[PDB]
Amino acid sequence: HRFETFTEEPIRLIGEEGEWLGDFPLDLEGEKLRRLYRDMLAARMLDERYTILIRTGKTSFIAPAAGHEAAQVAIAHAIRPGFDWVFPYYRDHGLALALGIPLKELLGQMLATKADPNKGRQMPEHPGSKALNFFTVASPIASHVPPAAGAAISMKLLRTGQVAVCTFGDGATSEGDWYAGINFAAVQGAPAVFIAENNFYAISVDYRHQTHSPTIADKAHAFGIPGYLVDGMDVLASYYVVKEAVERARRGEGPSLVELRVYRYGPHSSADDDSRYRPKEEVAFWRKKDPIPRFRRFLEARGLWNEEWEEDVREEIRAELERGLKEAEEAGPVPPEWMFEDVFAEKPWHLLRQEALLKEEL
């Protein structure tokens, strides 16, 4: 099976009544289907926990991912966590969670405690994990695209059989490095899948003022690779299209550009205010497209969901969140001296001198 490329209408698999729209049979086992739902709830609840962390001064910054759950959870399940690599951006904490990164580590990074394997080096929303090949988030928009291409080329040359998935927002597609990186990956037929989590906004700049191409998928023409327009609020459509791109990359057929249309329910960030440049009618309209209730209906229509399970799953998640936050906090503050560690493998003379100077003040 092969999805159609550059479709005018975004690819969908879940009908509004829960019907299967695929031109191929649904092959996911019931257990995996329910896990997709489970992880979307967990991602949503993590996001809501973040709102509380901001409100209580536990963290200084958050980038609301509510509305991106189907896209992020689908991507996490379309690859093999711990084997394949992920080059995410700051809004991907739902993806990070679904990938298996311990809440202790995600929250530790949000709180800058020693629970953060990244040692509180960066501001919140910059998680990273060596264990799960989750390339530490970097702030500059699209700066992680060329590295994603390079890692994929390495995978190809070393014959590891791995794939590198690279996620970014719509605004990122306007950066020169975004184009430059994908172009190289395409020429080398590297096993990389570039995925856009298109929420139609780059802070306050809307899609129309971002680029003139009708879709992001159309940009694939510039690289000679397949481009896909997908309903990012449809977890099955997102999963299967990305999975197909991953399989294509894994068999050596080169990269793909997958556009997952989603919506950012919250503001751009805790430092922003969405209810200032977006029409309430637009937000409300997309709120009715929440990926969670949509997939719930799909499961419910097949006897794969009920209220009791729903409640059980939610209580288990809130418990995991409470435990994760507790562990992150109990880890303790990061030492001042750590400011001089990891610039290089070993500290050179000037850093040793600078560290001694700071110690005078401590």
Binding site: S204, V205, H209, H350, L351, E361
Partner: protein, 323 residues
């Protein structure tokens, strides 16, 4: 009346745009949103989309387009959301903007301004705290200005807009609303290339600018308690910097401490320090001491310690004084 740096900057823009139709503002989120720091608030409403335009998310496009607009017939004031993000448009800045007049034998010019928030002290981590001025000063063809007060913000931004030479204008974000100072509404400008004497003194010269001003000023206050008079000189313009003001102060005091939050190695204060040593060795009663940001990426967890503290500055002052 009293206003914040943000208000003074906004006023400067409003004033220049009202005076010259050619003045246009462009950058990410500068229009409807009025800027992530509200510096361009209300300008789109007042001047229209042909005068204030949100751009795609590309610093190369912003800087380069600004250059083309300036070479053709406009006077663009481009905004780079954070100084940390100038890099994706670095080649446009150093290869196109900086060298246009020179490489064209003066046939083409770049009357453009590139403003950007900068500096630490705001928990911005690696890319919401950088002070990249050295990169600009090292590039021939770019004037560089870093303001630290609302009064200077308005006067110098207006001067930059009127200046035909390209100007990179740095606005320390920690100072955007840190204080409300008297800023005349009347039309006035300040001279680019001239330092400002914040406080006169004769025992020690404190050379500084931008981000670190709060700590440097308090350090001078602490010194005054001990009977030590520190002369605080805010350079303001980093390129071309006020050679005369610097040498006149150091010649008088015989001792100098230079402060900045930019990384130490090959920094702008290193240039001034090396110049003072090369030209005024005979006037120095103590070694020129530099208090700078550490040679590491800007840390989130230790933000409070990376940015020079009053204590760090005072320890350097004591070193110079007891030498």
């Amino acid at each position: 009346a009293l206003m914040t740096m943000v208000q003074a900057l906004n006023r400067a823009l409003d004033e220049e745009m009202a005076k010259d139709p050619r003045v246009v503002v462009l950058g990410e989120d500068v229009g409807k949103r009025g800027g992530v720091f509200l510096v361009t608030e209300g300008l789109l409403q007042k001047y229209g989309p042909d005068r204030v335009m949100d751009t795609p998310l590309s610093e190369a496009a912003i800087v380069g387009a600004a250059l083309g607009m300036a070479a053709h017939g406009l006077r663009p004031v481009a905004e780079i959301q954070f100084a940390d993000y100038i890099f994706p448009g670095f080649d446009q800045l150093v290869s196109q903007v900086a060298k246009l007049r020179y490489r064209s034998g003066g046939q083409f010019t770049a009357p453009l301004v590139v403003r950007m928030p900068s500096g630490g002290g705001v928990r911005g981590g690696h890319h919401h705290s950088q002070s990249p001025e050295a990169h600009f000063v090292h590039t021939a063809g770019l004037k560089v200005v870093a303001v630290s007060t609302p009064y200077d913000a308005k006067g110098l931004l207006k001067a930059a807009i009127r200046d035909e030479d390209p100007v990179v204008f740095l606005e320390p974000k920690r100072l955007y609303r840190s204080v409300k100072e008297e800023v005349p509404e009347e039309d006035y400008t300040l001279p680019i290339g001239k330092a400002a004497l914040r406080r006169e003194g004769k025992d020690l010269t404190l050379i500084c600018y931008g981000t670190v001003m709060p700590e440097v000023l308090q350090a001078a206050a602490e010194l005054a308690k001990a009977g030590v008079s520190a002369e605080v000189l805010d350079l303001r313009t980093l390129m071309p910097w006020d050679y005369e003001a610097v040498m006149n102060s150091v010649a008088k005091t015989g001792r100098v401490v230079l402060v900045s939050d930019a990384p130490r190695h090959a920094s702008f204060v290193s240039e001034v320090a090396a110049t003072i040593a090369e030209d005024l060795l005979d006037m120095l009663l103590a070694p020129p001491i530099r208090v700078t940001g550490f040679d590491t990426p800007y840390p989130y967890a230790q933000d409070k310690l990376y940015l020079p503290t009053v204590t760090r500055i005072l320890n350097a002052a004591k070193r110079a004084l007891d030498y």
